[PDB]
Nucleic acid binder design. Structure first.
Lengths: 247, 247
DNA sequence: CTG
DNA sequence: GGAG
DNA sequence: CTG
DNA sequence: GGAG
């Protein structure tokens, strides 16, 4: 099966990802920015107990670490959501290079009607943050019944950060550049963590999907085995139904 | 004085006006209009007693007459104000030929710095309405303590009617056409019932004003002696102060 | 009265 | 959601 | 939590 | 007068 042949490529069997070829990202600030420290709004016990196992898993994975930072933004009430709006305002803008899906799909021709669709799991967390940029994303974490109050921050590209989709898309494009060169017959559409491979034949789509999974796993990315649509003639991609070259 | 020399021209001494050269006006309706009869809102005694002497004076003057009409619009609460909006909607539009005052004043040159300003009193009432058009403007009048309920209507161009300013301005232009031809040295600006005469010299402004008053009174119009600004170098006209050729 |  |  |  |  596909699950057995590519254990490294699937999130189910490959462990948390880590894009080993990508340098840790430095996040430039705007020219006039200084740190902003926003007080953590008090959180109910119900919310805290709901968030806690998530925080602990991230700590165990090294995705969160303790820190002392002049930056602080609040966590909101369950899985944790950080309000990074005041950090986002202080970070230098980058050009938005992620194509809109309508335009991305224009590049899909009718000669290629066999499709594989993969979505990468925990995509942003596969990209490391440079230690100089980690303090930007700090938040407070209290455990009233263990006696630890202090800050944590992210060692990977965080959710809620305005440049994460663009930085991830650019990184994955660098990492898949050689795959494209080695498989010029195939069409590969990338939309952040949502990937479509298109081929002429069921076989060429199988061999290409095998190459792509091998490549993704080797690079440190992980795809959802549960959601994968492998070597079909009909797939859902980016909210479209792809059938008969339509849509 | 000016009051003594031109008794016919002034409202104070000449009686109510009546533009004797102007045919009674016929008011064309829109192609699809039919009569509208709006019920008179009950009026308080205080309002009725306030309006009554005005109605009686207009009846005495023949400006109001009794009628039976399929049209009816309400009087509002003191001097009477008729709500003619539903009649206005059913009357055919005419081109708006009254110039805006800014443009009207552009036609005043600096060579003419002696001014006379007259305003005509009860201007619209000087124009007769054709009997076929009189029923359009009917309203109800009750006297609870004399026992008369029935309609009245106007025999003259009414207040509140959307075409009155334009029809009056056009009529007065016809009536003053010959004056302009006989006095080509003078500037005469007309804005509905507000008239400015401009001359080169105090004398020429006096002789022109004498001619204009004689002409206006003869035609049946009446000017306010109280408000007249006669042969001055400074006047207020149409909300401007005219001084030194300025404004 | 019905920005 | 001051006009007549 | 801050048309 | 739904965003993070």
């Amino acid at each position: 099966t596909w699950l057995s042949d590519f254990p490294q490529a699937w999130a189910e069997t490959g462990g948390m990802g880590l894009a080993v070829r990508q340098a840790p990202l430095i996040i430039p600030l705007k020219a006039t920015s200084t740190p902003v420290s926003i007080k953590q709004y008090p959180m109910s016990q119900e919310a805290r107990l709901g968030i806690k196992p998530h925080i602990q898993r991230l700590l165990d994975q090294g995705i969160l670490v303790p820190c002392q930072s002049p930056w602080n933004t609040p966590l909101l009430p369950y899985r944790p959501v950080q309000d990074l709006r005041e950090v986002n305002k202080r970070v230098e803008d980058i050009h938005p290079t992620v194509p809109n899906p309508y335009n991305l799909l224009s590049g899909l021709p009718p000669s290629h009607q066999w499709y594989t669709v993969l979505d990468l799991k925990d995509a942003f967390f596969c990209l490391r943050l440079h230690p100089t940029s980690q303090p930007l994303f700090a938040f407070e974490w209290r455990d009233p019944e263990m006696g630890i109050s202090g800050q944590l921050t992210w060692t990977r590209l965080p959710q809620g950060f305005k440049n994460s989709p663009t930085l991830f898309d650019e990184a994955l494009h660098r990492d898949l550049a050689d795959f494209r060169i080695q498989h010029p017959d195939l069409i590969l559409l990338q939309y952040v963590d949502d990937l479509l491979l298109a081929a002429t034949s069921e076989l060429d789509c199988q061999q290409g999907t095998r190459a792509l999974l091998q490549t993704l796993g080797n690079l440190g990315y992980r795809a959802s085995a549960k959601k994968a649509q492998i070597c079909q003639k009909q797939v859902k991609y980016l909210g479209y139904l792809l059938k008969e070259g339509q849509r």
